Design a protein around this ligand. Structure first.
Ligand SMILES: [Cl-]
Ligand SMILES: [Cl-]
Ligand code: NA
Ligand code: NA
Lengths: 121, 212, 212, 121
């Protein structure tokens, strides 16, 4: 069955870096665009970054551009998120999502992971 | 930054409720809308895509629409298991990405509604001696259990240093919460007054305190 | 009235934790013990019966025992999905019925522990003019998120009129809660002082205020 | 499958009365003892009342004796709880539970309902 598993969340210091992973199972990752969605405690959903199936187009949320970078390895069935120059406002749970389409052009997210927590102190 | 949704709505079992979401020429007018449902402590789930199409495993009482720059999600025959937080979402050409709504918390009523009691507390003398000035705005005895809080220094909005707890059910089955603002003793004496305003289903109450 | 359990315990993933439950000659010594697991907002579920027998669908890492007037529930290889509240239970010949334990909240650690900051607030002047005297004891920046609170009038315990909110996660991923005591202006001026004591994983902090 | 459904919870006034129902499905009710368990907001579990399969033995919690009464109708597959002279301390969620044994002699409760809420004002 279709499953998304995230890993890498930890408690780090302000200004540090961290790298998150999302392993996909039960489908062909090379046919789907992917993205990251985060949620701070008691607040709403926020779009972080997205990438198309070929990795040739990337977009970012306004709060994380020039700081975060998204990548993927279709043969290893894995999506990554590199986070640099962290600040306290990055403390949230980060979800790995999969789109039905092969391109990052919509807000349709059919599958969600369980999420990983990041703490900035 | 976000699409505009009402912060909270409710209805009685068997009733039909609707949730609004309003956008701009940059998003909803030119891009389709998606709806997501989230229960406490779990991931959000898609319940509607491409304006008005339902995923498999979503009851027929759910229905979506789009008109101009706004959308709506209709739920007929309210059941207890529909109590959740609902978000709208669409692509946005100005942001080059996805824009979300603020979220609407839906409650299935099972007791009479009640307006909150609000009490505001100035800093205590023991914490002022440790170079601290924290204010507390106590909110109690309200139903349904969703509120929004805003602080002001004199008459200007304050956003930094604000924390508000998730509403909690108490022994009379009504809700309570607290909001605290962390200040330095200079900021507190710097101004003429501070204020705490609470919103509950659209209605508002405000209180004010001053250094003595 | 109840069996004695620790209010909270924790461990790191992969670790092995144990939960205690101590009774009397009226219950545990002559009657077998049962264990129940409850996740937030759902019904409790049996995970162990007849001292040390596991229902179908309960991992082999769960294990129970009984010795004298006390029992224990052991969990090996802690996983995230084990975070819940655990109750013990047994028949009691003095009560002619079932006696429960107080409940133990188990947390799987994912960040460093932290002791709570406590601040106590005397009544505000606006609420005193409306014939009201409510005290607030603010508790913030603690982990894991479980606390126990006790109030005192001078030196005598107070139980009537106490409400405490369920701990809430805030923007730094630490927890916060509030406890308020509703009094009349006579009761408040009647005594020399009031106190608020907070317990967190066995450790205690106390504060005191007085009418000025 | 085995299912327990409760009904009757409502908001009433101090000193009033209320009657709760529990309908059982998926098994033979006449072979099992039954009981009620309640939980006040933010607090623990509390034993309210129990009855054996034949209805010839009943026990009660110390807080509700002389006020509450338990009954059953095996042909209608239903268990009841009559609550009289209600007080604010009766505000809680009430669970309907089923024992594996035919007699009310243990704290083993194999099946639980979802519960009904009672508010006393
Ligand atoms: Cl596929
Ligand atoms: Cl049977
Ligand atoms: Na395919
Ligand atoms: Na049978």
């Amino acid at each position: 069955q279709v499953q998304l598993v995230e890993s890498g969340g930890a408690a780090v210091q302000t200004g540090g870096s961290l790298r998150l992973s999302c392993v996909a199972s039960g489908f062909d990752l090379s046919n789907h665009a992917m993205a990251w969605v985060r949620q701070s405690p008691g607040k709403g959903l926020e779009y972080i970054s997205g990438i198309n199936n070929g990795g040739t187009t990337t977009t970012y949320g306004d709060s994380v551009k020039d700081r975060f970078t998204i990548s993927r390895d279709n043969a290893k069935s894995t999506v990554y998120l590199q986070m640099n120059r962290l600040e306290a406002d990055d403390t949230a749970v980060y979800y790995c999502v999969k789109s039905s389409y092969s391109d990052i052009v919509s807000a349709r997210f059919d599958s969600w992971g369980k999420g990983t927590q990041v703490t900035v102190s | 930054s976000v699409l505009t949704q009402p912060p909270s709505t409710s209805g009685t079992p068997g009733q039909r409720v609707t949730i609004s979401c309003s956008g701009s020429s940059s998003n909803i007018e030119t891009n389709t809308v998606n709806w997501y449902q989230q229960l406490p402590g779990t991931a959000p789930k898609l319940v509607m895509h491409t304006n008005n199409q339902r995923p498999s495993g979503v009851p027929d009482r759910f229905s979506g629409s789009r008109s101009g720059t706004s959308a709506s999600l209709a739920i007929g025959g309210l059941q207890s298991e529909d109590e959740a937080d609902y978000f709208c979402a669409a692509w946005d050409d100005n942001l080059n990405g996805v824009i979300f709504g603020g979220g609407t918390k839906l409650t299935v009523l099972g007791q009479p509604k009640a307006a909150p009691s609000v009490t505001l507390f100035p800093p205590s003398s023991e914490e002022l001696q440790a170079n601290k000035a924290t204010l507390v705005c106590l909110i109690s005895d309200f139903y349904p259990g969703a509120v929004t809080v805003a602080w002001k220094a004199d008459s200007s909005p304050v956003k930094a240093g604000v924390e508000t707890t998730t509403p909690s059910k108490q022994s009379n089955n009504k809700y309570a919460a607290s909001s605290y603002l962390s200040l330095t003793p200079e900021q507190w004496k710097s101004h003429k007054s501070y204020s705490c305003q609470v919103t509950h289903e659209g209605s508002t109450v405000e209180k004010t305190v001053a250094p003595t």
